[PDB]
Design a protein around this ligand. Structure first.
Ligand SMILES: CCCCCCCCCCCCCCCCCC(=O)O
Ligand SMILES: CCCCCCCCCCCCCCCCCC(=O)O
Ligand SMILES: [Cl-]
Ligand SMILES: [Cl-]
Ligand SMILES: [K+]
Ligand SMILES: [K+]
Lengths: 259, 41, 259
């Protein structure tokens, strides 16, 4: 008939000890161990809001003095949350963003603000009065600095199945000449666009404004553990480290025989 | 029609069409008026 | 269960004619036609012995004057059998070889002869007395010129499934420089070795000897008909033709309107 023949790892509580791997090298007693493992579930480890951005709109100075700012969404500028995330290679999750806004010294004034999510390809505001603030399709939040911090849920938005903290490659084909090495490690699947903020008015606001953005990871999944960062972070988009001062992971001592 | 002009594999495609329902396309608040009542002018 | 879904043409007698393709364009009668098709069966067409070699061992002259001859078996030197065979691309068959031997004028004398089949790789006789005539493994026939013609059956011996009259290629890899174009069309699967003949004696025979070899194809199979040779043959191993005198396949006449 056929012409060709060739054609869960961690349970809810800690393991008990039975009376005589401890009970393998030493004599043991029985211990009814009911210590929980829930707090080390990745969800509890990650679902804690952490700082991911500090945006300023001063009234004086040489930057963002026009009452609006387009902040390219890049969550790798703060060491604490970054190191936790980088314990894994890939992570998938929804996120809760909270916007804590105040003047530079922490005082609050009755000032109306608008935060708009500008996905990749949507036109960015070019002034406090730009037509883009009409926000007929993009999601916007109007809130006062005297209101409690604004807060919204952002779903998992990557074109890929998970965000990836490490992408060993280039975004496109071509020669990869020295002049473009900045391309290395750049994963467009993590590029979520712009976050735009403005004081709501055609006239300039007399208040300097500082916005602290916190992100809380939720409904998280993680894949492929990796060694934890042991050198200070230098740049947002690469793992460069200071070659002249390579830190040892552990503190030192004089002799291997004395504490 | 791919599987008509080229040889295809089976793809169990579960991509949702909900976000393009006109309700989701339109039910987003947008600016329709700016009214001013200045004290001078 | 499966992760990937994508993974006889001519009868014994001539057709009859039925009373009304003749009976399609003209009115016909019934003809009970019992004309046989047997004589055109390839076996009857081919199983007729034909000349394939004429070997001479003169006593005087400048060739084969030592009472022995090593004849490289190449059956394409005689036009009649060659053209019939070349009607096909591949042919498989056994063969009956008959050896008609006499002096140059047809007279017969009491002379003992030996014919030995020397397959490719067997040592060839280098004299009338060579050790190879011991013929301890090769097949030999000892016969007198006064006996009836010697005759033997040779089986189908090619390493391939059929002999091939046309091989569009080269026997080996390599550059194929102009100096070696003789290689083109050479099929080793048809190369059956050597046919060796000698007068049986350490002393020279006073008789000039002419051997005519006839081959009768039998138990034949043939594949892929091709246009029949329409130019005189020039060489044994290629279809070269005389370019300055290309023969028309049909005779000519003065006008297309008169016979
Ligand atoms: C209406 C106001 C809401 C706007 C909130 C800002 C939304 C920003 C997009 C959220 C993307 C979260 C995934 C981040 C993946 C990390 C990318 C990176 O920094 O390399
Ligand atoms: C004992 C004496 C018997 C020797 C008889 C000669 C045998 C020659 C070998 C027969 C081979 C027949 C196949 C020929 C195929 C055609 C090859 C060619 O000429 O291109
Ligand atoms: Cl507006
Ligand atoms: Cl001998
Ligand atoms: K237990
Ligand atoms: K018939």
């Amino acid at each position: 008939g056929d012409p060709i023949a060739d054609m869960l790892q961690v349970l809810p509580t800690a393991a008990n000890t039975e009376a005589s791997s401890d009970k393998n090298l030493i004599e043991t007693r029985c211990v009814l161990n009911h210590h929980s493992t829930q707090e080390t579930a990745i969800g509890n480890f990650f679902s804690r809001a952490g700082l991911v951005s500090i945006i300023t709109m001063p009234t004086t100075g040489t930057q963002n003095t026009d009452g609006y700012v387009n902040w390219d969404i890049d969550l790798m500028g703060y060491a604490q949350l970054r190191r936790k995330c980088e314990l894994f290679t890939y992570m998938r999750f929804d996120a809760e963003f909270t916007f804590v806004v105040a003047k530079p010294n922490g005082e609050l004034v009755p000032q109306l603000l608008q935060y708009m999510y500008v996905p990749p390809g949507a036109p960015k505001p070019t002034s406090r009065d730009s037509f883009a603030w009409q926000t007929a399709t993009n999601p916007s939040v109007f809130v006062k600095m005297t209101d409690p911090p604004a807060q919204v849920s952002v779903p998992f938005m990557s074109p890929a199945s998970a965000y990836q903290w490490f992408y060993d490659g280039y975004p496109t084909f071509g020669e990869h000449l020295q002049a473009n090495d900045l391309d290395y490690g750049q994963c467009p699947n993590n590029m979520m666009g712009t976050f735009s903020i403005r004081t709501v008015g055609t006239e300039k606001s007399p208040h300097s404004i500082t916005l602290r953005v916190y992100m809380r990871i939720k409904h998280v999944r993680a894949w492929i553990p990796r060694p934890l960062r042991n050198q200070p972070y230098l740049f947002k988009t690469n793992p460069n480290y200071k070659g002249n001062d390579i830190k040892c992971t552990s503190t030192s001592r004089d002799k291997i025989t004395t504490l």
